């Protein structure tokens, strides 16, 4: 995955 934050 591409970097993301939830």
């Amino acid at each position, epitope marked *: *995955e*591409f970097r993301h934050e939830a």
Partner: antibody
Amino acid sequence: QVTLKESGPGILKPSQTLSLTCSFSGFSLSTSGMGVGWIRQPSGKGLEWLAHIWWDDDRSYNPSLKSQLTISKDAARNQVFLRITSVDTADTATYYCVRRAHTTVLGDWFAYWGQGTLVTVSA
Amino acid sequence: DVLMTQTPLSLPVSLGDQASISCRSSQSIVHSNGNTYLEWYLQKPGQSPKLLIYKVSNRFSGVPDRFSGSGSGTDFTLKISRVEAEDLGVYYCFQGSHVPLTFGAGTKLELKR
């Protein structure tokens, strides 16, 4: 105000190495969550994603061009760089600098784009 | 790669018509975190792209309410209730969930005659 500015050499030949600068302001790359990237568009053609670099030196690349790309930064000078080795006509495109965060409150999206820089690869 | 197929690639309209652009991904855009990072960009002749829609159906600041976004999984649509003049250009769907990041090939919103 947030602004991004690309600079490139305009013309270069095949085999040669493309060095592109981007110079931002309005934010710092040091900020946790911040990121800056490159996207391009060949003449009257789609939009191709190239690379992204994160504040904490982490990097994302496009598999097809991975062996040709090197994105780097200088957060003290507000600059992102991208090298492409062994160019050819193919690579003739407009190159865009974009801002993208991986946290919501910082803006997880391609909101900010520069004017972009024209790069023609011809012999 | 995740493929963004837009339909149609050319969309003639009259000013004041409603328009719809389908975008379908070759695989799910739901990031493992919970979110669907599906965006829409507009590029007007000789201009940089501008973000219109993010996470399926969130309008960007400054984007007029005549634009909306809809869909889930691998099936998305942009709608424009009344095409205004300034709306004509090329529209891209984008997925920001998977590496590498991909755009659709672009839908030309052009003038019918």
